[PDB]
Amino acid sequence: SPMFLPCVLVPNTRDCRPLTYQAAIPELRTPEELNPIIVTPPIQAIDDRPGILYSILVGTPEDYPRFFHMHPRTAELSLLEPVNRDFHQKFDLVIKAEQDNGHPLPAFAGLHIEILDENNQSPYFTMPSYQGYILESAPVGATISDSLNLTSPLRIVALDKDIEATKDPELHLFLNDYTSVFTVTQTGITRYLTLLQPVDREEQQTYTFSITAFDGVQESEPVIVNIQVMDANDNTPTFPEISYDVYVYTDMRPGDSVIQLTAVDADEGSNGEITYEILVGAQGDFIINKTTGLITIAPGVEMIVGRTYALTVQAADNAPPAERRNSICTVYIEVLPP
Ligand SMILES: [Ca+2]
Ligand SMILES: [Ca+2]
Ligand SMILES: [Ca+2]
Ligand SMILES: [Ca+2]
Ligand SMILES: [Ca+2]
């Protein structure tokens, strides 16, 4: 005698379509968070004070009394305990409505409850840290490499147990620093780092920062990244001045310090290693120390009063010839009397 609502007509007949009500419950969430359980459409039977009592007649699996209670007058559905989807994926219940006047003529309707999977696993990186390498002469857009050889790209793999293994988890990656220097690719299971701006080893040789993944709900633990900027020979050995006027004296004798030249090269290792050489002009009377740049009188040589000299001095770094850099200094020497 009571009918569940809505009554959806079965065309070409006088019959109401039997109802299967629908609810859905986020796995592992609590009653307090979820209650009351929203049912679509809302549960209601008709014939203030309806005089109708609602209850759950039967359901499968038979665990359901442990998880659900229905209010007799309101048909309100209350969760009693959080549901683990590993153990329970769904419930199918039958709802009874009957009159309370003492003449029950029960009606029945279905209620289907889905237990929903949720984004409830934090994303994660498959390494505890990442070491990258980049040459300072690399252009914008260059990919950071995973080795000194610079032959293969630094691979950053971010996964998420909420997503299928072979499927892209579509994570967002936050950098905590240097976001105007480096950027991370925005799609894919494997991410890479590229240059937004050229880097100069002589300004900064190392970059340390961390990356955090985000799945729309939870963040990963931050993962630490170090990037090493490798030297290019892009600095030239440089004297303080183009030329130097210096005077020597008749009394001076072989071995005596004539002048100390000092050039500067900011590059790393042998790229910054300077070698000095007199190309021409010493006329046998002066020599220079290959590594110190100090010029002195040559052995078995005496100054003559009038003599002048023009020494052409070269400073070069010890990069391979193809990349070698040098500059020239000219040293004018005149002998004087004390
Ligand atoms: Ca997740
Ligand atoms: Ca999940
Ligand atoms: Ca440089
Ligand atoms: Ca150099
Ligand atoms: Ca350099």
Coordinates of C-alpha atoms in Angstrom, one line a residue, residues 73-321:
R73 CA 11.1 7.1 11.0
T74 CA 13.4 9.2 8.8
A75 CA 15.1 6.4 6.8
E76 CA 18.4 8.2 7.5
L77 CA 21.4 6.0 6.7
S78 CA 24.2 6.1 9.3
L79 CA 27.6 4.6 8.8
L80 CA 28.8 2.9 12.0
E81 CA 32.4 2.1 11.2
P82 CA 35.0 3.0 8.5
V83 CA 35.1 0.7 5.5
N84 CA 38.2 -0.9 4.0
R85 CA 37.7 -1.6 0.3
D86 CA 40.2 -4.4 0.3
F87 CA 37.7 -6.3 2.4
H88 CA 34.4 -4.8 1.2
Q89 CA 33.8 -3.4 -2.3
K90 CA 30.0 -3.0 -2.2
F91 CA 26.7 -3.7 -0.4
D92 CA 23.3 -4.6 -1.8
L93 CA 20.4 -4.2 0.6
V94 CA 16.6 -4.4 0.6
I95 CA 14.7 -1.6 2.3
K96 CA 11.3 -2.3 3.9
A97 CA 8.6 0.3 4.4
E98 CA 5.5 -0.5 6.4
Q99 CA 2.6 1.3 8.2
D100 CA 2.6 1.6 12.0
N101 CA -1.2 1.4 12.5
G102 CA -1.0 -2.3 13.0
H103 CA -2.0 -3.3 9.5
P104 CA 1.4 -3.6 7.7
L105 CA 1.3 -4.1 4.0
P106 CA 5.1 -3.9 3.3
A107 CA 6.7 -2.4 0.2
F108 CA 10.3 -3.1 -0.8
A109 CA 13.1 -1.3 -2.7
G110 CA 16.7 -1.9 -3.5
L111 CA 19.6 0.1 -2.0
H112 CA 23.1 -0.3 -3.6
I113 CA 26.1 1.1 -1.8
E114 CA 29.5 1.5 -3.6
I115 CA 32.7 1.6 -1.6
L116 CA 34.9 4.1 -3.4
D117 CA 38.6 4.0 -4.0
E118 CA 40.2 7.3 -3.0
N119 CA 43.4 9.3 -3.7
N120 CA 44.7 8.3 -0.3
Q121 CA 48.3 7.3 -1.0
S122 CA 51.1 9.9 -1.0
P123 CA 53.2 10.1 -4.2
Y124 CA 56.9 9.2 -4.0
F125 CA 60.3 9.3 -5.7
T126 CA 62.1 6.1 -6.6
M127 CA 65.5 7.6 -5.4
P128 CA 66.4 9.1 -2.1
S129 CA 68.3 11.9 -3.9
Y130 CA 69.4 13.1 -7.3
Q131 CA 72.8 14.1 -8.6
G132 CA 72.9 16.1 -11.8
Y133 CA 75.6 17.7 -14.0
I134 CA 75.5 20.6 -16.5
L135 CA 78.2 22.3 -18.6
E136 CA 78.3 26.0 -18.1
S137 CA 78.4 26.6 -21.9
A138 CA 75.1 24.8 -22.3
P139 CA 72.3 26.8 -23.9
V140 CA 68.8 27.5 -22.6
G141 CA 66.7 24.3 -22.9
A142 CA 69.6 21.9 -22.2
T143 CA 68.7 18.9 -20.2
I144 CA 70.6 18.2 -16.9
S145 CA 72.7 15.0 -17.2
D146 CA 73.2 12.2 -14.7
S147 CA 76.9 11.9 -15.0
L148 CA 80.2 13.7 -15.7
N149 CA 80.2 12.3 -19.2
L150 CA 77.0 14.3 -20.0
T151 CA 75.8 11.5 -22.3
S152 CA 72.5 10.7 -20.7
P153 CA 69.7 12.8 -19.0
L154 CA 69.0 12.9 -15.3
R155 CA 65.9 10.7 -14.8
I156 CA 63.4 11.7 -12.0
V157 CA 60.7 9.0 -11.5
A158 CA 57.7 10.0 -9.4
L159 CA 55.1 7.3 -8.7
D160 CA 51.8 7.0 -6.8
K161 CA 50.1 3.8 -5.6
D162 CA 46.7 5.4 -6.4
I163 CA 47.6 5.2 -10.1
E164 CA 48.4 2.1 -12.3
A165 CA 52.1 1.3 -12.6
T166 CA 52.4 1.9 -16.3
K167 CA 50.1 4.9 -16.3
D168 CA 51.2 8.5 -15.8
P169 CA 50.1 9.6 -12.3
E170 CA 49.9 13.2 -13.5
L171 CA 51.7 14.7 -10.5
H172 CA 52.6 18.4 -9.9
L173 CA 56.3 18.9 -8.9
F174 CA 57.2 21.9 -6.7
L175 CA 60.7 23.3 -6.6
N176 CA 61.7 25.0 -3.4
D177 CA 64.4 27.1 -5.0
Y178 CA 66.0 28.3 -8.2
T179 CA 62.7 28.2 -10.1
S180 CA 64.1 31.0 -12.4
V181 CA 67.2 28.9 -13.2
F182 CA 65.8 25.3 -13.6
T183 CA 62.4 24.0 -14.6
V184 CA 60.9 20.5 -14.6
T185 CA 59.0 18.8 -17.4
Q186 CA 55.2 18.9 -16.6
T187 CA 54.1 15.5 -17.9
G188 CA 55.2 11.8 -17.8
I189 CA 56.2 9.1 -15.4
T190 CA 59.9 10.2 -15.9
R191 CA 60.6 13.9 -15.5
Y192 CA 63.7 15.9 -16.5
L193 CA 65.4 19.2 -15.5
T194 CA 66.2 21.9 -18.1
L195 CA 67.8 25.3 -18.0
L196 CA 65.6 28.4 -17.9
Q197 CA 68.8 30.6 -17.8
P198 CA 72.4 30.0 -18.8
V199 CA 74.7 29.3 -15.8
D200 CA 78.3 30.4 -15.3
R201 CA 80.5 28.2 -13.1
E202 CA 82.7 31.2 -12.2
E203 CA 79.6 32.8 -10.6
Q204 CA 78.2 29.6 -9.0
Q205 CA 79.5 26.1 -9.3
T206 CA 76.9 24.1 -7.4
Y207 CA 73.1 24.2 -6.9
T208 CA 71.3 22.5 -4.0
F209 CA 67.5 22.4 -3.7
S210 CA 64.6 20.0 -3.2
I211 CA 61.5 18.8 -5.1
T212 CA 58.1 18.0 -3.8
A213 CA 55.4 16.0 -5.6
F214 CA 51.7 16.7 -5.2
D215 CA 48.7 14.5 -6.2
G216 CA 45.9 17.0 -5.6
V217 CA 45.4 15.8 -2.0
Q218 CA 48.8 14.9 -0.4
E219 CA 52.4 15.9 -0.9
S220 CA 55.4 13.6 -1.0
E221 CA 58.4 14.0 1.3
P222 CA 60.8 16.6 -0.3
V223 CA 63.6 14.9 -2.2
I224 CA 67.0 16.7 -2.3
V225 CA 68.8 17.5 -5.6
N226 CA 72.4 18.6 -6.2
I227 CA 73.5 19.9 -9.6
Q228 CA 77.2 20.4 -10.4
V229 CA 78.2 23.0 -13.0
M230 CA 81.2 21.8 -15.0
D231 CA 83.9 24.2 -16.3
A232 CA 84.3 25.4 -19.8
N233 CA 87.4 27.2 -20.8
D234 CA 85.7 30.6 -21.3
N235 CA 88.1 32.8 -19.4
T236 CA 91.3 34.2 -21.0
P237 CA 94.6 34.7 -19.1
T238 CA 94.7 38.4 -18.4
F239 CA 97.5 40.8 -17.4
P240 CA 96.6 43.9 -15.3
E241 CA 97.9 46.2 -18.0
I242 CA 98.6 46.1 -21.8
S243 CA 102.3 47.2 -21.4
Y244 CA 104.8 47.9 -18.7
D245 CA 107.7 50.4 -18.6
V246 CA 110.6 49.0 -16.6
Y247 CA 114.2 50.2 -16.0
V248 CA 117.4 48.1 -15.3
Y249 CA 120.9 49.2 -14.3
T250 CA 124.5 48.5 -15.5
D251 CA 125.6 47.2 -12.1
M252 CA 122.8 44.5 -12.0
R253 CA 124.0 40.9 -12.6
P254 CA 122.6 37.6 -13.9
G255 CA 119.9 35.9 -11.8
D256 CA 118.6 39.2 -10.5
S257 CA 114.8 39.7 -10.4
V258 CA 113.9 42.0 -13.3
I259 CA 110.1 42.0 -13.1
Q260 CA 107.3 39.8 -11.8
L261 CA 104.3 39.3 -14.2
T262 CA 101.0 38.0 -12.9
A263 CA 98.1 37.0 -15.1
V264 CA 94.6 35.9 -14.1
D265 CA 92.5 33.0 -15.3
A266 CA 89.3 32.2 -13.4
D267 CA 88.7 28.8 -15.0
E268 CA 89.0 25.5 -13.2
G269 CA 92.1 23.2 -13.1
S270 CA 94.3 23.1 -16.2
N271 CA 91.8 25.5 -17.8
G272 CA 93.1 28.1 -15.3
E273 CA 96.7 26.9 -15.3
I274 CA 98.8 29.7 -16.8
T275 CA 102.0 29.2 -18.7
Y276 CA 104.3 32.2 -19.5
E277 CA 106.5 32.5 -22.5
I278 CA 108.8 35.2 -24.1
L279 CA 107.9 35.0 -27.8
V280 CA 110.6 37.5 -29.0
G281 CA 112.5 40.6 -28.0
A282 CA 114.7 39.4 -25.1
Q283 CA 117.6 39.2 -27.5
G284 CA 119.3 36.5 -25.3
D285 CA 119.6 38.8 -22.4
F286 CA 116.4 38.0 -20.5
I287 CA 114.5 34.8 -19.6
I288 CA 111.2 34.0 -17.9
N289 CA 110.0 31.4 -15.5
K290 CA 107.5 29.2 -17.3
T291 CA 105.1 28.9 -14.3
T292 CA 105.8 32.0 -12.1
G293 CA 106.0 34.7 -14.8
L294 CA 109.1 36.2 -13.1
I295 CA 111.5 37.7 -15.6
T296 CA 115.3 37.7 -14.8
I297 CA 118.7 38.4 -16.4
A298 CA 120.0 35.5 -18.5
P299 CA 123.2 33.7 -17.5
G300 CA 126.6 35.1 -18.7
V301 CA 125.0 38.5 -19.7
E302 CA 126.0 42.0 -18.7
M303 CA 123.9 45.1 -19.2
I304 CA 125.2 47.8 -21.6
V305 CA 124.2 51.4 -20.8
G306 CA 122.3 52.3 -24.0
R307 CA 120.5 49.0 -24.7
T308 CA 116.7 49.0 -25.0
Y309 CA 114.5 46.0 -25.4
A310 CA 110.9 45.2 -26.3
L311 CA 109.8 41.8 -24.9
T312 CA 106.6 40.3 -26.2
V313 CA 105.3 38.0 -23.4
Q314 CA 102.5 35.5 -23.7
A315 CA 100.2 34.1 -21.0
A316 CA 98.3 30.9 -22.1
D317 CA 96.1 28.5 -20.2
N318 CA 96.6 24.7 -20.5
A319 CA 93.3 23.8 -22.1
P320 CA 93.6 21.6 -25.2
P321 CA 94.9 23.6 -28.3

